[PDB]
Design a protein around this ligand. Structure first.
Ligand SMILES: Nc1ncnc2c1ncn2[C@@H]1O[C@H](COP(=O)(O)OP(=O)(O)OP(=O)(O)O)[C@@H](O)[C@H]1O
Ligand SMILES: [Mg+2]
Ligand SMILES: [Mg+2]
Lengths: 257, 296
């Protein structure tokens, strides 16, 4: 109640400072958007195996994109960066992070414990220990408080859509978390109830459907094409009752925008 | 920043994962505290949290992290040096006590530090006099962020440990799945009381003892004072039902405004418990100043 406005305002400042470089992939000589999609999809599976928070997944992805914004990485080491990022995200966010041994295990022993740990140190150095980054998830849970009344399918579907955005650097790297959360929340609301982006959230965020339109057009497409996408771990995960099986919901064909 | 530029003066504490030293920057003359952190699970999550959170929190009433010296098997956190902790100061004031203008100044500053934490989505979760540092100019600052965390809005379930027992809020003690900023306010209410009497308000030796001590002081809460209390995971209907005593008897030296504020910080229901932000405007603080400590 108190601090909700202060916190939102603070997170809006921080998402700008914590944003990765939109064009970093074109500056990576050895890795592609496709390779990054593969990695993020694997991290989703890792989160599933260890029952990690969605917030942990989002943080790890933010760490990877920022790391790769300033460090060139060969394709054989991309998974090492992702593993270290997920380890850091877990230590930050989880009540009970998995042990390092568990992280070494899920990399099929491609990498050693010493490697994982040295990479943890490198990632902390590159990020200068700046780990409290805003995520799509953090804006979503704030936005969810504006539902009339609360609807679990809306909440789960919006998280699903926010998660899909993590996979595809083109186009989602160019949108801020608060804007992705906005598109995701509207699209979820519209899919489940036919309602839209409430004016109470215009008052809070300053975003309208006009300002959300570009990301929403992108998100609507990703939603429609999701069954055909090469990466499927998110859809599979959101079949679970824990998330009200929302990946089984039909996307709308039109948005009227 | 690097270790060659520092001359160690003396040990000033031992926390965990390392010793804490008083040191001097040989080039600038600046006096600092060096918290060493020893490095098989890698960087401890407590240090990951402490460093990441402190780097976001720049405020006159929060200990300043100046630098991180980050090497092979060693991690050094460089902090601004502060001369004493509040616990040592209270012990030094055993017999004459702490002047009211100083108590009020310290409480006001603690609330400012805490409101800044909460506005930046940070829970401290270990407020106690040992973790509050004072300087010769009259400043008091929140320190030891090793147990802190970044919270979300709304909160989800966090670690059920948290807060050293004497300062631990009843909602943690009764196992509520959700706790939030109000837990730090509870701790500060206990510390306010302690500054005035110089003895812990609720010095329990176990969780149940802790609860019963609180109940004996503020009355056993029912559904009227705290809706939902009887359904809490660790609530037991066999709990003795103590009458709430005259609140002027809890901290007898406090006059009307002080009692009002204390009572609001020690409200059972986390929703009704005063926020740090709202407390800054309490009439108790109408005449607040910032004098230096009355002792060396
Ligand atoms: N900036 C500082 N200036 C002066 N003294 C300090 C400073 N930081 C820490 N200390 C001293 O070292 C003690 C322990 O450090 P701190 O509380 O930060 O970590 P900790 O591991 O939680 O310690 P403990 O385990 O003793 O509670 C403090 O209570 C204080 O007396
Ligand atoms: Mg490339
Ligand atoms: Mg301490």
């Amino acid at each position: 109640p108190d601090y909700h406005e202060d916190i939102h305002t603070y997170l809006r400042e921080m998402e700008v400072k914590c944003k990765p470089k939109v064009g970093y992939m074109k500056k990576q000589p050895d890795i592609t958007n496709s390779m990054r999609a593969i990695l993020v999809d694997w991290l989703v599976e890792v989160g599933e195996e260890y029952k990690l928070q969605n917030e942990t997944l989002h943080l790890a992805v933010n760490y990877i994109d920022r790391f790769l914004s300033s460090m060139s990485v060969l394709r054989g080491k991309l998974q090492l960066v992702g593993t270290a990022a997920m380890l850091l995200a877990s230590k930050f966010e989880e009540i009970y992070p998995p042990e390092v041994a568990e992280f070494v295990y899920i990399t099929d022993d491609t990498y050693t414990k010493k490697q994982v740990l040295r990479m943890e140190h490198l990632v902390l150095k590159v990020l200068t220990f700046d780990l409290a980054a805003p995520t799509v998830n953090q804006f979503l849970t704030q936005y969810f408080l504006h539902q009339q009344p609360a609807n679990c399918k809306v909440e789960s579907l919006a998280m699903f859509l926010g998660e899909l955005s993590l996979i595809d650097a083109d186009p989602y790297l160019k949108y801020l978390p608060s804007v992705i959360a906005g598109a995701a929340f509207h699209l979820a609301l519209y899919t489940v109830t036919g309602q839209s982006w409430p004016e109470s959230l215009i008052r809070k965020t300053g975003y309208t459907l006009e300002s959300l339109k570009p990301c929403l057009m992108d998100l609507h497409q990703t939603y429609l094409k999701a069954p055909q996408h090469a990466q499927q771990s998110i859809r599979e995960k959101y079949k679970n009752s824990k998330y009200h099986g929302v990946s089984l919901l039909n996307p709308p064909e039109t948005l009227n925008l | 920043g690097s270790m060659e530029n520092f001359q160690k003066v003396e040990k000033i504490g031992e926390g965990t994962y390392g010793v804490v030293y008083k040191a001097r920057n040989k080039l600038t003359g600046e006096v600092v505290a060096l918290k060493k952190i020893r490095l098989t699970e890698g960087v401890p999550s407590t240090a990951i949290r402490e460093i990441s959170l402190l780097k976001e929190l720049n405020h006159p009433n929060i200990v300043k992290l100046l630098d991180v010296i980050h090497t092979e098997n060693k991690l050094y956190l460089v902090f601004e040096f502060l001369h004493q902790d509040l616990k040592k100061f209270m012990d030094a004031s055993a017999l004459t006590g702490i002047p009211l203008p100083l108590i009020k100044s310290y409480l006001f500053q603690l609330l400012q530090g805490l409101a800044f934490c909460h506005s930046h989505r940070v829970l401290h979760r270990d407020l106690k006099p040992q973790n509050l540092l004072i300087n010769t100019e009259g400043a008091i600052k929140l320190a030891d962020f090793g147990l802190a965390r970044a919270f979300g809005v709304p909160v989800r379930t966090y670690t059920h440990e948290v807060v050293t027992l004497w300062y631990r809020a009843p909602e943690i003690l009764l196992g509520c799945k959700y706790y939030s900023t109000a837990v730090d306010i509870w701790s500060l209410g206990c510390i306010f009381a302690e500054m005035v009497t110089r003895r812990a308000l609720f010095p329990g030796d176990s969780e149940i003892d802790q609860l019963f001590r609180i109940f004996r002081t503020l009355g056993t809460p029912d559904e009227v004072v705290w809706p939902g209390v009887t359904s809490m995971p660790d609530y037991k209907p066999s709990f003795p039902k103590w009458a709430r005593q005259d609140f002027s008897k809890v901290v007898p030296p406090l006059d009307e405004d002080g009692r009002s504020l204390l009572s609001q910080m020690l409200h059972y229901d986390p929703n009704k418990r005063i926020s740090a932000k709202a407390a800054l405007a309490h009439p108790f603080f109408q005449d607040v100043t910032k004098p230096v400590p009355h002792l060396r």
